[PDB]
Amino acid sequence: SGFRKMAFPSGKVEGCMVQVTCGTTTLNGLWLDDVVYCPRHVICTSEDMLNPNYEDLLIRKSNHNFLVQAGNVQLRVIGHSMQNCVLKLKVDTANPKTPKYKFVRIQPGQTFSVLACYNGSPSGVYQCAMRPNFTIKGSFLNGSCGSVGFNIDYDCVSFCYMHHMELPTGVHAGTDLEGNFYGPFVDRQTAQAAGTDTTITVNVLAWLYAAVINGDRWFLNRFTTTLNDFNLVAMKYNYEPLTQDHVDILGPLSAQTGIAVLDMCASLKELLQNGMNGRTILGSALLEDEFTPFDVVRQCSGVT
């Protein structure tokens, strides 16, 4: 028993972190096979960030200008190319620690672990969710760019995020491993604002199921609702509209607890309408939305 915001073991990803320096800028790179992936803004100075022409800036850079270091050993750069907002540095040595890996672009609402790094060295690991407004609420400082987000499936690491930018509002923006930003963000020091951040309703429900499995049942009421009646309340509280796909995905959690999805929705509706009244659910005084139904099933069944 017990329910915690759990991250995947980071070992396989730690073995891939390198330091990439270009000029005066140092950030993190991801070394997989003979390619080092890093944010393309490594080629910029803070002056360039106002309106960078990355194609023009990259033209003044050669293989020998990109300093790549894995631990205290220097990697030899034999190629460089820009793919969207990431640079791919071809090195002459394949990473001996490359795990089985995939590059996947995640959907808003899905979760992933971040291995926060500085100078190619890991400092910490935490669990995140790709917010519906395509931002992530991470913990990143200067030097953390190039830190990656991933999921693990037994032995296969699915890389889904590379950290690029902190918005003036304190939230974080980045790309998938093909260099495409999540959301409308651009790698430029300009006024960019995150849109409305809605709550991932399906994740809140999955977390309510985790609370029930783990003993917290005070919020269960004698009521039920319909998908349309629940969504009228979800819109008012800036919650994502619940779809039949969401109800289907919650199926195994509903089967395990013996509580129908629409019954759990009625409990959620009353929690939204009346608040927690000073009570907690899984040690939290607010509705948690960063656990997918997959995360709940995984944590409650012990998937290694």
Show which residues are catalytic.
41, 145
Q: Which is nearer to a second copy, 53 or 304 (CB)?
A: 304
Q: Which two tokens stand for residue 115?
A: 């291995």
**Residue of 214, 299, 219 whose CA lies nearest to 264:** 219
CB of 49 to ligand LR0, least distance (A): 5
Q: Which two tokens stand for residue 34?
A: 């003979």
Residue 23 sits in the site that holds a second copy (CB under 8 A): no
* Alpha-helical segments (H) within 45-172: 54-59
174, 161 Cβ separation under 8 angstroms? yes
Per CB under 8 A, which region of 46-54, 83-91, 140-148, 219-227 contacts a second copy? 140-148
> Nearest to ligand LR0 by Cβ — which residue?
187
**Edge-first strand listing for the sheet containing 86-91:** 73-75, 66-70, 17-22, 25-32, 35-39, 86-91, 77-83
Q: Which two tokens stand for residue 35?
A: 């390619």
Using alpha carbons, list the distances in angstroms from residue 7 to 18, 40, 113, 186: 21, 27, 5, 28
- Residue 230 interacts, among ligand LR0, a second copy, none and using kind-specific CB cut-offs from 5 to 8 Å, with none
- Contact map string, positions 209 to 228, toward a second copy, x by CB under 8 A: -----xx-------------
Q: Which is nearer to ligand LR0, 37 or 239 (CB)?
A: 37
Q: Which is nearer to ligand LR0, 147 or 198 (CB)?
A: 147
Applying CB under 8 A, what is the total number of residues that bind a second copy? 53
299, 6 Cβ separation under 8 angstroms? yes
Residue ranges in 159-178 that form contacts with a second copy under rule CB under 8 A: 166, 170-172
The continuous run of DSSP H or E covering 30 comes out as strand 25-32
Amino acid in the structure at residue 39: P
- Residue 119 interacts, among ligand LR0, a second copy, none and using kind-specific CB cut-offs from 5 to 8 Å, with a second copy
Q: Which is nearer to a second copy, 83 or 214 (CB)?
A: 214
Query: Which residue among 75, 117, 205, 268 contacts a second copy (CB under 8 A)?
Result: 117
DSSP 125: E
**Residue of 228, 217, 211 whose CA lies nearest to 282:** 211
Residue 140 sits in the site that holds a second copy (CB under 8 A): yes
DSSP 65: G
Q: Which residues bind ligand LR0 (CB under 6 A)?
A: 41, 49, 140-142, 144-145, 164-166, 187-189
Query: Which residue among 139, 238, 243, 273 contacts a second copy (CB under 8 A)?
Result: 139
123, 143 Cβ separation under 8 angstroms? no
Task: Give the interface with a second copy as residue ranges (CB under 8 A).
Answer: 1-12, 14-15, 115-119, 121-126, 137-141, 143-144, 166, 170-172, 214-215, 275-276, 278, 280, 283-286, 298-304
